[PDB]
Every structure is written in structure tokens, then in C-alpha cells.
Design an enzyme around this catalytic site. Structure first.
Site, mmCIF file in Angstrom:
data_model
loop_
_atom_site.group_PDB
_atom_site.id
_atom_site.type_symbol
_atom_site.label_atom_id
_atom_site.label_comp_id
_atom_site.label_asym_id
_atom_site.label_seq_id
_atom_site.Cartn_x
_atom_site.Cartn_y
_atom_site.Cartn_z
ATOM 1 N N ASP A 9 -5.807 10.217 -2.093
ATOM 2 C CA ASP A 9 -5.907 8.838 -2.556
ATOM 3 C C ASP A 9 -6.702 8.753 -3.853
ATOM 4 O O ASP A 9 -6.903 9.764 -4.534
ATOM 5 C CB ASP A 9 -6.539 7.952 -1.477
ATOM 6 C CG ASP A 9 -7.880 8.476 -0.994
ATOM 7 O OD1 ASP A 9 -8.398 9.447 -1.584
ATOM 8 O OD2 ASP A 9 -8.417 7.911 -0.018
ATOM 9 N N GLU A 61 0.793 -1.222 0.000
ATOM 10 C CA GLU A 61 0.000 0.000 0.000
ATOM 11 C C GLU A 61 0.829 1.278 0.000
ATOM 12 O O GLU A 61 0.249 2.370 -0.010
ATOM 13 C CB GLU A 61 -0.952 0.011 1.205
ATOM 14 C CG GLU A 61 -1.995 -1.096 1.173
ATOM 15 C CD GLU A 61 -3.072 -0.925 2.230
ATOM 16 O OE1 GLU A 61 -2.967 0.015 3.047
ATOM 17 O OE2 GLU A 61 -4.025 -1.734 2.243
#
Ligand SMILES: Cc1c(C#N)cccc1-c1cc(-c2cn(Cc3cccc(C(C)(C)O)n3)nn2)nc(N)n1
Ligand SMILES: CC(C)CCC[C@@H](C)[C@H]1CC[C@H]2[C@H]3CC=C4C[C@@H](O)CC[C@]4(C)[C@H]3CC[C@]12C
Ligand SMILES: CCCCCCCC/C=C/CCCCCCCC(=O)OC[C@H](O)CO
Ligand SMILES: CCCCCCCC/C=C\CCCCCCCC(=O)OC[C@H](O)CO
Ligand SMILES: CCCCCCCC/C=C\CCCCCCCC(=O)O
Ligand SMILES: CCCCCCCC/C=C\CCCCCCCC(=O)O
Ligand SMILES: CCCCCCCC/C=C\CCCCCCCC(=O)O
Ligand SMILES: CCCCCCCC/C=C\CCCCCCCC(=O)O
Ligand SMILES: CCCCCCCC/C=C\CCCCCCCC(=O)O
Ligand SMILES: CCCCCCCC/C=C\CCCCCCCC(=O)O
Ligand SMILES: CCCCCCCC/C=C\CCCCCCCC(=O)O
Ligand SMILES: CCCCCCCC/C=C\CCCCCCCC(=O)O
Ligand SMILES: CCCCCCCC/C=C\CCCCCCCC(=O)O
Ligand SMILES: CCCCCCCC/C=C\CCCCCCCC(=O)O
Ligand SMILES: CCCCCCCC/C=C\CCCCCCCC(=O)O
Ligand SMILES: CCCCCCCC/C=C\CCCCCCCC(=O)O
Ligand SMILES: CCCCCCCC/C=C\CCCCCCCC(=O)O
Ligand SMILES: CCCCCCCC/C=C\CCCCCCCC(=O)O
Ligand SMILES: CCCCCCCC/C=C\CCCCCCCC(=O)O
Ligand SMILES: CCCCCCCC/C=C\CCCCCCCC(=O)O
Ligand SMILES: CCCCCCCC/C=C\CCCCCCCC(=O)O
Ligand SMILES: CCCCCCCC/C=C\CCCCCCCC(=O)O
Ligand code: NA
Length: 450
Positions: A220, A211
Site C-alpha cells: 500500500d 478502494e
């Protein structure tokens, strides 16, 4: 046979191999799109300097080995031209080292910062700086501009390298500042690359591979502000609101930037919450209780990606995991929608379930540095080939009354320095498969015709 004839023959043989070998390097990059990356832009620039070593620098060294009479500025160019090529090689080797550190430091954002246009600008700048550094004696820092070798007539000097090129330039400016310091910087960069690949693996490093790790606040995929390893800060469209949330969790005013230790502590609290949610789920707790520490991290990895409810839907895989049927659980998990959506992350997590080790994430780190090991060999060969000449120049400089190094050592150190313009294409052919495959294709098709 004359002793000079064997020196000419060796130098001309090195020149031929330096041209042919490094032409093959540029030819391979121009032909193979798989070789057209930023790292090979500096490899080509390095090869271009080595080609010029065989075309000009080596013939230049042969002529100045005789000490013929010539004009001062004209003699300096013949003597100082190789200093330009060597300086450009150092900049290219330093650029390759820095490029590989960026590749392992920010492997997800490497292509956004390291671009071809930026590399061409750096190469053009470094070539300008190499001419300024290599031809510095021509701009005044020389020994043939003062009135006083004898037997050459005024306005003409005996063209010997140690007669026209000042020794304090060769030791202080060239060796210490322009060679030794970059070589030591390249040593520390490659050391730092090798240590990062040898880092201890854990749940923090596993999720950092899956991640990412960001020490600055970013947006994001959904435009929400995030920090660390996927730690959501706020849904609000205000970076100030995200920083306020970040400061409340770190305990310090961050201005959106945190240290790696603070990201690790933040991630550790996220793991505790995910573990607390796993234990309160009646489907996940029996499996989690049965798993080892590593396989528990793989289950937490799945929870971080899909949530406890999504993982609890793997009723068949969870039971086989609890029954320690690793290979059976691997086949079942591979036939899931989770595998099809993100196969690379799923394969690493599934491998963790099968083996109970960090091998899938260690192999990820090893793949990122395998090219650095071959390119680090080239730097060591550069140091091994050039340091003898530099060390001798230091002896002549710091011990003037000392006996000068013998002639055979001069011939060896100078020829060894020229040999470095030959070794790089051999390294590429031996350690880089994409270079070796293109070399064989060019040789078998373009050269041998069959
Ligand atoms: C350039 C350089 C760099 C760079 N870039 C870095 C370190 C050192 C040097 C360097 C190079 C030369 C040199 C001399 N010659 C002509 C020659 C050839 C064969 C034999 C002879 C004799 C007869 C022995 O005088 N001379 N070619 N290179 N000499 C010295 N002190 N340093
Ligand atoms: C250890 C390395 C990395 C750093 C030291 C620099 C080295 C390369 C330099 C700095 C000082 C230099 C000189 C130190 C003093 C001596 C004595 C003198 O009669 C001649 C050379 C000579 C031998 C030099 C050798 C090289 C030299 C040691
Ligand atoms: C990393 C690569 C390793 C390979 C590199 C090995 C070292 C370089 C080779 C030197 C042989 C030639 C050195 C001798 C120079 C020619 C012979 C000579 O000295 O002739 C001059 C004569 O004495 C007066 O004219
Ligand atoms: C005209 C330009 C092209 C001329 C090329 C011929 C001259 C070779 C010169 C130097 C060798 C270069 C470095 C060594 C490269 C060898 C690559 C190679 O042959 O590897 C294939 C082999 O099958 C692996 O097993
Ligand atoms: C690789 C192949 C290299 C072949 C030979 C390089 C040129 C050799 C000519 C020697 C001439 C020197 C002399 O006779 O003084
Ligand atoms: C005489 C000096 C010759 C200098 C080098 C010639 C080749 C320069 C390398 C550029 C090749 C282009 C490419 O490979 O993309
Ligand atoms: C000795 C100087 C001349 C030899 C060095 C330069 C030649 C080799 C350079 C790289 C080979 C591949 C790049 C050539 C691009 C060709 C352009 C084109 O054909 O469109
Ligand atoms: C002699 C002077 C040679 C100077 C440098 C040649 C150009 C550098 C090699 C091309 C680098 C750009 C690239 O490969 O993308
Ligand atoms: C590979 C291409 C470059 C090679 C062709 C260039 C020609 C070689 C240059 C000069 C060699 C002979 C001239 C100097 C003779 C030195 C006399 C002596 O040894 O004392
Ligand atoms: C492949 C071709 C390579 C050509 C290499 C040519 C080698 C040139 C060597 C030096 C020749 C003399 C140049 C300096 C003379 C100018 C100073 C003066 O006129 O007094
Ligand atoms: C390739 C040519 C590059 C530049 C050569 C510059 C020479 C320096 C001055 C020459 C002195 C002289 O004419 O004798
Ligand atoms: C591949 C071809 C390379 C092109 C350059 C060929 C070799 C050049 C050698 C050096 C010449 C410059 C040194 C002295 C310049 C002054 C000499 C003069 O004016 O007569
Ligand atoms: C100017 C001389 C000193 C530079 C030597 C080499 C340093 C740069 C090394 C290569 C990095 C790879 C390309 C990355 C582009 C840099 C991004 C930017 O422009 O800020
Ligand atoms: C004299 C000419 C010397 C070499 C010129 C090399 C610079 C041009 C080639 C650049 C290669 C490229 O990036 O396309
Ligand atoms: C009298 C000596 C004359 C010296 C001329 C050198 C000045 C020009 C500077 C560098 C020329 C080499 C070109 C390399 C840059 C091309 C790389 C690139 O942008 O892709
Ligand atoms: C043009 C690009 C930037 C150039 C800066 C770096 C290149 C080196 C420039 C000149 C260095 C001159 C150093 C002076 C030393 C003392 C002078 C002397 O004693 O004769
Ligand atoms: C590639 C990085 C290059 C960095 C260049 C800048 C560093 C230069 C440091 C000083 C070198 C010369 C120190 C003394 C100057 C000579 C004294 C003189 O003779 O006048
Ligand atoms: C790293 C760069 C180191 C540069 C040089 C350090 C020593 C400088 C001493 C200058 C001496 C002055 C002179 O040469 O006459
Ligand atoms: C002291 C000046 C700088 C010396 C060269 C610096 C570059 C060193 C880079 C790595 C060394 C070679 C790495 C190859 C790994 C082989 C395993 C080993 O023998 O250590
Ligand atoms: C003396 C100069 C030494 C340079 C080494 C710098 C540290 C290595 C690094 O972390 O990049
Ligand atoms: C290893 C490289 C050592 C180089 C040898 C230095 C000899 C000193 C001298 O003979 O004056
Ligand atoms: C890493 C191995 C590279 C081999 C290159 C060839 C070594 C010998 C160099 C020239 C020989 C001239 C006589
Ligand atoms: Na070089």
C-alpha cells in the site's frame, strides 16, 4: 450510360471519401493532445489501413474486375493486397476491444500495463502479421503456379480474384481462422465489458470502486502488504509473513493469490467488524440504526476510510443524517477536511447519503464503458460490411455445382466491403465529442480557412 461507368464512379467516390475521412482522423489525433491515448493509436492504425483502401485496394479491385492477362505473382499482389489491409483492420479492432476490457477490468492499473510504447510494438507486429497472412497466396498457396487461363499466353494468367486466390484459403484460413474467430472473440469481449458495467451494485462493489480490488498481494502507500479491498495483512517487511496471514484468513494455501469470491468473503468479515465497532460507539449507533441499507453502506465507507473515531467527529452531520435531512447533511459534509482531501470519493459517498441509491457508483461504471459502445458499433459495421462476401465465398466453396451468385450481388457485396473504409470517421464525429470538436476545428480553420 455504361453499366461499368456507374461501378467505376461509385468505387472512386468511395475511395475519395475513405481517404478524406480517414486523413481527418489521423489529422485530428496528431493535432489534439486529448486524443493522443493508446486507444487512438489503434484507431490511427485502423485509419491508415482505410486510407490505403482508397488509394490502392479500390483501384486494384477495378483492374482485376476485367480479368486481364498478367504474371501470376504480379496478379496475386493486386488481388491479395486488400487482404493485408483487412487483416490489419481486424487486429486493430481486436486490440481496441481488448484495450477497453482492460480499462474496465483494472481501471486503476490500466496505464501501468497499457502504454504507448507497448501499443506501437503491437501495431508494428500486427502489420507484419497482416502482410504474412494477406500475402500468403504469393508464398506458394495460389492457383497460377501449376501448368495447364487460356488466351493469355504461358507465364501469364487471367487476373481474376476467384481464379488466382484459392477458395480453401479464403474460407478456412482467412474467413474461419482470421476473420470469424477474431470477430467472435471481439463479440465476447464487448459482451463481457457491457456485463461488467451492468453488474449489481452493493457495499463490496462500492468499496471496490473507492478502494480497489486486488487478488494478488501488493504494497500500500505505507509499504504494507494488502489483499482484496484494503485488507491489511501484516506490517512485517516479509511477503512470506503476509502470505501466512492470508492463508490463515482464507483457509487455503494461496501463494499470495485469491479468487474474487474469497476477496468478497474477506471483505464481508471486515464489514462485520466495522459494523460491530459502529454499534458499540454511542455516537454512531443511533445514526446507523436510523439509516437504510444503502446509507448504512455509505457510513461504513467513511469508517473504512477514517475510522470510527474520525466519523464520530461529524457531530453536526451525524445528527442531520439521523434526522433524515439528507440535503443539509450533504452541504455540511462537503465543507469538511475529508471532502478537501479526497473530493471524488467524498462526493460519491455524499451523493449516496442524499439519494440512498448506488447512482454515484453506477455512473462511475457507465462512464468507463461509454467509449466502448461507440467502438463496438464499428466492429458490427465491419462484420455487416464483410460477412456477405465471406458467406458467398462459402457457397462457391462448399457448393461447387451450385449456381454462382449473380453479378449484381457480386458488385453489391464487393462495393459494400469497400464502403466500410468510409463509415469509421462518421462514427467518431457522431459519438465522440473530442473527435467531433477537432473535426470542426480542422475543417473550419485549415480547410475552409474561415
Ligand atoms: C478480398 C476479400 C476479402 C478481404 N480482404 C474478404 C472476403 C472476400 C473477399 C473477396 C473479394 C473479391 C473481389 C473481386 N474483385 C474484383 C471485382 C470487382 C467488381 C466485380 C468483379 C466481378 C466482375 C464480379 O468479378 N470483380 N475485388 N474484390 N472477390 C471475392 N470472391 N472475395
Ligand atoms: C452459423 C455460423 C455462425 C457458423 C456456420 C458457418 C457458416 C457461416 C458456413 C459453414 C458451413 C457453410 C456452408 C454449409 C453448407 C452450405 C451449403 C452449401 O450448398 C453451400 C453453402 C453452405 C450454405 C454453406 C453456408 C456457410 C456456412 C454455413
Ligand atoms: C453500412 C454502409 C451501408 C451503405 C452501403 C450500401 C451497399 C453498398 C452500395 C452499393 C451500391 C453500388 C452497388 C452496385 C455496383 C455498381 C453498379 C453495377 O453493378 O454496375 C456493374 C454493371 O452491371 C457491369 O458493369
Ligand atoms: C483533406 C482532409 C480533410 C477533409 C475534410 C472534408 C472531407 C470530408 C470527408 C469525409 C467526412 C469525414 C467524416 C465526417 C466528419 C464530419 C465532421 C463534422 O463536420 O462535424 C461537425 C459538425 O458541425 C457536427 O455538427
Ligand atoms: C466525393 C466526390 C466524388 C466525385 C467523383 C469521383 C470520380 C468520378 C469520376 C467518374 C469516372 C468514371 C468513368 O467515367 O468511367
Ligand atoms: C498509400 C498508403 C497510405 C497509408 C497511410 C498514410 C497515413 C498513415 C497514418 C499515420 C499518421 C501519423 C499520425 O496520425 O500520427
Ligand atoms: C493518400 C496518401 C497521403 C495522405 C495520407 C497521409 C496524410 C495524412 C496523415 C496524417 C495527418 C497528420 C499527421 C501528419 C504529420 C505531419 C508531420 C509534421 O508536420 O511535423
Ligand atoms: C500501407 C501500409 C501502412 C502501414 C501502417 C502505417 C503506420 C500505422 C499508423 C501509425 C500507428 C502508430 C501511432 O499512431 O502511434
Ligand atoms: C482516389 C485516388 C485513386 C483513383 C485514381 C486511380 C485510377 C483509377 C484506377 C483504374 C480505373 C480504370 C482502369 C480499369 C478500367 C476497367 C475497364 C472496365 O470497366 O471493364
Ligand atoms: C493513387 C494512385 C493509385 C495507383 C493504382 C495503380 C493501379 C495498378 C493496377 C494494376 C496494373 C497492373 C499491375 C500488375 C501487372 C504486373 C504483372 C505483369 O506484368 O504481367
Ligand atoms: C508497391 C510494389 C509492391 C510489390 C510488387 C511485387 C510484384 C510481384 C511480382 C511482379 C511480377 C511481375 O513483374 O510481373
Ligand atoms: C500513393 C502511392 C502508392 C505507391 C504505389 C503506386 C501503385 C503501385 C501499384 C502496383 C505495382 C505492383 C504490381 C505489379 C508489379 C510489377 C509490374 C512491373 O514490374 O512492371
Ligand atoms: C500479435 C497479434 C495479436 C495481438 C492483437 C491485439 C492484442 C493486444 C491488444 C491491445 C492491448 C493494449 C495495449 C496493452 C499492452 C499489452 C501489455 C503487454 O505487453 O503485455
Ligand atoms: C509507401 C509508404 C507507405 C506508408 C508508410 C507508413 C509508415 C510510416 C508512417 C508511420 C506513422 C507514425 O507512427 O509516425
Ligand atoms: C512484395 C510485397 C512487399 C511487402 C512489404 C511489406 C513488409 C513490411 C511490413 C509492414 C510495412 C508497414 C509498416 C507498418 C509498421 C509501422 C507501425 C509502427 O511501428 O508505428
Ligand atoms: C512471418 C510471421 C509468421 C507467419 C505465420 C502466419 C502467416 C501465414 C504463413 C504461411 C501460411 C501457409 C499455409 C500453408 C497451407 C498449405 C500450403 C499449400 O497447400 O499450398
Ligand atoms: C489471426 C489468427 C490467424 C491464425 C492462423 C492459424 C490458423 C490456421 C488454421 C488452418 C487454415 C488452413 C487449414 C487447411 C490448410 C489448407 C489445406 C491445403 O490445401 O493444403
Ligand atoms: C478455426 C480454423 C479452422 C480451419 C480449418 C478447418 C477445416 C480444415 C480442413 C482442411 C481440408 C484440407 C484441404 O483443404 O484440402
Ligand atoms: C458474429 C461475428 C461478430 C459480429 C460483431 C461482433 C461485435 C458486436 C459488438 C456490439 C454490437 C453493437 C453494440 C451497439 C449497442 C447498440 C444496442 C444494440 O442494438 O444492441
Ligand atoms: C469459437 C471461438 C469463440 C471465441 C469466444 C471466446 C470467449 C469470449 C471471451 O470471454 O473473451
Ligand atoms: C446476409 C448476407 C447473405 C449473402 C447472400 C448469399 C447468397 C448465396 C448465393 O447466392 O449463392
Ligand atoms: C454511419 C454512416 C456513414 C456514412 C458513410 C457514407 C455512406 C455511403 C458511402 C459511399 C457512397 C458512394 C456512392
Ligand atoms: Na478497414
Amino acid at each position: 450510360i455504361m453499366g461499368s461507368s456507374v461501378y467505376i464512379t461509385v468505387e472512386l467516390a468511395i475511395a475519395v471519401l475513405a481517404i478524406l475521412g480517414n486523413v481527418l482522423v489521423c489529422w485530428a489525433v496528431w493535432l489534439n493532445s486529448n486524443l493522443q491515448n493508446v486507444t487512438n493509436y489503434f484507431v490511427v492504425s485502423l485509419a491508415a489501413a482505410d486510407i490505403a483502401v482508397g488509394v490502392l485496394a479500390i483501384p486494384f479491385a477495378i483492374t482485376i474486375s476485367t480479368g486481364f492477362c498478367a504474371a501470376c505473382h504480379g496478379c496475386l499482389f493486386i488481388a491479395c493486397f486488400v487482404l493485408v489491409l483487412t487483416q490489419s483492420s481486424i487486429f486493430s479492432l481486436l486490440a481496441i476491444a481488448i484495450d477497453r476490457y482492460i480499462a474496465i477490468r483494472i481501471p486503476l492499473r490500466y496505464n501501468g500495463l497499457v502504454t504507448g510504447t507497448r501499443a506501437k510494438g503491437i501495431i508494428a507486429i500486427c502489420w507484419v502479421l497482416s502482410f504474412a497472412i494477406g500475402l500468403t497466396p504469393m508464398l506458394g498457396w495460389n492457383n497460377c503456379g501449376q501448368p495447364k487461363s487460356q488466351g493469355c499466353g504461358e507465364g501469364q494468367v487471367a487476373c481474376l480474384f476467384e481464379d488466382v486466390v484459392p477458395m480453401n484459403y479464403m474460407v478456412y484460413f482467412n474467413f474461419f481462422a482470421c476473420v470469424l474467430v477474431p470477430l467472435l472473440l471481439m463479440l465476447g469481449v464487448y459482451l463481457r465489458i457491457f456485463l461488467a458495467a451492468r453488474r449489481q451494485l452493493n457495499i463490496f462493489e462500492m468499496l471496490r470502486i473507492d478502494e480497489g480490488l486486488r487478488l494478488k498481494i501488493y504494497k500500500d502507500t505505507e509499504g504494507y502488504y494488502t489483499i482484496g479491498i484494503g485488507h491489511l495483512l501484516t506490517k512485517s517487511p516479509s511477503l512470506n509473513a503476509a502470505k501466512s496471514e492470508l492463508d490463515k484468513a482464507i483457509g487455503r494455501n494461496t501463494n499470495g493469490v485469491i479468487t474474487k469470491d474469497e476477496a468478497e468473503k474477506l471483505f464481508n468479515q471486515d464489514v462485520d467488524a466495522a459494523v460491530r465497532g459502529i454499534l458499540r460507539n454511542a455516537k454512531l449507533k443511533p445514526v446507523y440504526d436510523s439509516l437504510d441499507a444503502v446509507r448504512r453502506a455509505a457510513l461504513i465507507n467513511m469508517v473504512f476510510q477514517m475510522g470510527e473515531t474520525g466519523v464520530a467527529g461529524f457531530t453536526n452531520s451525524l445528527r442531520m443524517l439521523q434526522q433524515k435531512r439528507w440535503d443539509e447533511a450533504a452541504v455540511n459534509l462537503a465543507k469538511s477536511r475529508w471532502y478537501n482531501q479526497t473530493p471524488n470519493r467524498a462526493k460519491r459517498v455524499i451523493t449516496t447519503f442524499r439519494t440512498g441509491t448506488w447512482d454515484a457508483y453506477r455512473s462511475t461504471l457507465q462512464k468507463e464503458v461509454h467509449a466502448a459502445k461507440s467502438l463496438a458499433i464499428i466492429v458490427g459495421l465491419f462484420a455487416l460490411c464483410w460477412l456477405p462476401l465471406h458467406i458467398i465465398n462459402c457457397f462457391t466453396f462448399f457448393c461447387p455445382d451450385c449456381s454462382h451468385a449473380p453479378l449484381w450481388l457480386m458488385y453489391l457485396a464487393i462495393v459494400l466491403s469497400h464502403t466500410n473504409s468510409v463509415v469509421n470517421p462518421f462514427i467518431y464525429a457522431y459519438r465522440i465529442r473530442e473527435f467531433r470538436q477537432t473535426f470542426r476545428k480542422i475543417i473550419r480553420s485549415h480547410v475552409l480557412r474561415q
